[PDB]
Structures are given as structure tokens and as C-alpha cells.
Ligand binder design. Sequence first.
Ligand code: HEM
Ligand code: HEM
Lengths: 149, 149
Amino acid sequence: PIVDTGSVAPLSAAEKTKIRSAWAPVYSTYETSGVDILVKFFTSTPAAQEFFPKFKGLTTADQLKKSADVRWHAERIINAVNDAVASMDDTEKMSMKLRDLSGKHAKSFQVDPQYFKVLAAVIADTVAAGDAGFEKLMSMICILLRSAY
Amino acid sequence: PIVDTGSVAPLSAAEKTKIRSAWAPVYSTYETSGVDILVKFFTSTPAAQEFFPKFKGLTTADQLKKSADVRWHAERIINAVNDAVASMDDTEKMSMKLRDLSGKHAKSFQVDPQYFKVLAAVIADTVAAGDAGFEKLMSMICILLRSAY
Ligand code: HEM
Ligand code: HEM
């Protein structure tokens, strides 16, 4: 399961390879994947909706997929994950970028840190449901995303 | 015409209104608009191509529209303009964000500052060809984008 506290063991060359494979297809059409992942997370997790101000009024999954605000937010989130995937070999660069992002979530967007893993899970199901390796990569991302809180 | 030096007169309430109108449709489907604007700029301005490292190998306009790298870069650029459009009433906020962006272009991406206006022109043709008001908004953006150089 995905964790957002403590530490997780490094990624093995084997795990990185599977991740890159499962990711390629999804990121290949990130504009669609991203929106589905975000629309899914948003609709099924009511408690977290108050944190998407620009989505006020939107409710049906159909309205969301059409809002340019939703698409932009999804494209940015989905590309952040991609940056992480592209940096599995430079864990130092991966950290700097995410810690920076952590700060923005805590100081500006003011989002409750508990949902990072909830959304991470949706991304995991969609990309490679069941793969522990990918779950490990999402854990690193969640742990770093909470580093500024 | 669009300028990237000196200063330009403030935007009148009348100009801001036309801008918001011409922009709404374009930004409404920014993922497509952005890619066309960028693909157009890139293909017709060979001299500036060396500054898009992630596009090495890409040549036909068809290849570009399919690359995820091109789409992401276009979506980011097109949204930067949108941020500016959304801030015409808070020229102070508009400056901070752009100056920051100026620094990135000069210190990291290392892009030749002369093309800002060339691309700004393509964005102007597409959005509201001929409108001086919109050209004024693009000038503010180019002047600020060169402030770090
Ligand atoms: C793996 C999880 C997540 C990733 C990788 C992620 C990534 C990002 C990225 C890259 C941005 C763009 C920031 C910028 O424009 O500078 C962003 C913005 C934002 N994120 Fe997160 N995010 C995550 C989870 C969440 C969650 C769970 C929430 C809400 C419960 C959230 C709420 C926001 C908000 C409110 C913004 C600001 C959007 C705006 O006003 O334009 N994020 N996030
Ligand atoms: C109105 C004009 C322009 C705007 C508003 C604009 C906006 C942006 C934005 C918002 C980014 C994202 C930066 C980030 O990821 O933090 C960016 C990246 C970039 N821009 Fe500009 N840009 C403009 C013109 C240009 C021009 C003319 C060139 C090249 C001749 C250029 C080359 C780059 C490069 C190389 C990147 C880095 C892309 C990457 O490696 O991910 N930009 N620009």
C-alpha cells in the first residue's frame, strides 16, 4: 500500500523497468489519462472537493471533463508524476523538485496533506494496479509532498 | 506592432474587455490552440529551433503535434499568457510572475531573448489578428520576459 510517512526502500533496476513500461502508455496520452484520474479522484472523494476552488459549481463528471480549469490542473499533476518517473535515476533531482512543490501546496494552495496518498492510489490503479514497485514510487512522491508541512 | 523594449501605455477598460472576449474561445481549448501556435512558430522560424532541445529529430508539423513534449511545452506557454490575461487588473501580480519566468528563461533554459516577440506575434494573429489592444498586452509580456536578461 502507498505510504506518506517515514521512508521506503530504494527502487531496484527491475522495478524501474516495469514502472517505465506501465507509464509510457499512460503518459503518451496524459491529457486524457490525467483528466480521468483527477475526475475520478474528485467525484469519489467529496471531503477533498473544497480544496479545488476553481471547480466550484462543477459536479457531474461530464461537466468536469469539459472545464478548462480541470484539464489544466490535471495536466500539471500528471506531468509532475512524469517528472518523478523521469528522475528515478537521480533521486536528488527528484527531491528538490518535489520539496519545492510541497512548499507550494502547504504555503499557497493550503491543501490538507492527507489526500496526497488518496490521489496517488487512483494514479496507481490506472497505471499499474497491483504493482508494488509503482506503489513504492508513489510513496516516495507522497512522503516528499508532505515534507513542507 | 509588438515591442519588447521600453514601456507601453496602460490597458484601457475598453481594451481589457475586447481581450477577455478574444481570449475566452482560444483558452477554452488551449491544448489545441497552444499546440498549433507553437508548431506554427517552430516550423516557420528555423533559427529558434535549436532552443527546443527536447524537439531534436522532430521536423514535420505532424510529428510535432504528436509529441508529448511539444504538447506539454505548448500547454505551459499558453497558460502563462492566460495568467497574464487573468491579471490585467493587478499589473503588480502580473509583473512578479513574469519576471520570475524571465529569470528562468535567461538562467536555465538559456533562450535567445529576441524570439519572445516573434512567438508573441503568432499568438496575436491566432487570438485577435489586428487588435492593437491585444498587441499591447503581448508587449507588456515581452518587455517583462526580457527583464532578467
Ligand atoms: C501525487 C499528488 C499530487 C501531485 C503530484 C500534484 C501536483 C501539483 C502540481 C504540479 C501543481 C501545479 C502547481 C503550480 O501551478 O505551480 C499542483 C497544483 C495544485 N494542487 Fe496539487 N498535486 C497532488 C495532489 C493534490 C491534491 C490531493 C490536492 C487537493 C486535495 C491538490 C490541490 C492542488 C491545488 C489546489 C493546486 C492549485 C491549482 C491552481 O489554483 O491552479 N493537489 N499540484
Ligand atoms: C510569450 C512567450 C513565451 C511564454 C509566455 C513562455 C512561457 C514559458 C513557460 C510558462 C514555460 C514553463 C517553464 C517551467 O516549466 O517552469 C516555458 C518553458 C520554456 N520556454 Fe518559454 N515562453 C515563451 C517564449 C519562448 C521562446 C520564444 C522560446 C524559445 C525560442 C522558449 C523556450 C522555452 C524553453 C526551452 C523552455 C523549457 C522547456 C522544458 O525544458 O521543459 N520560450 N516558457
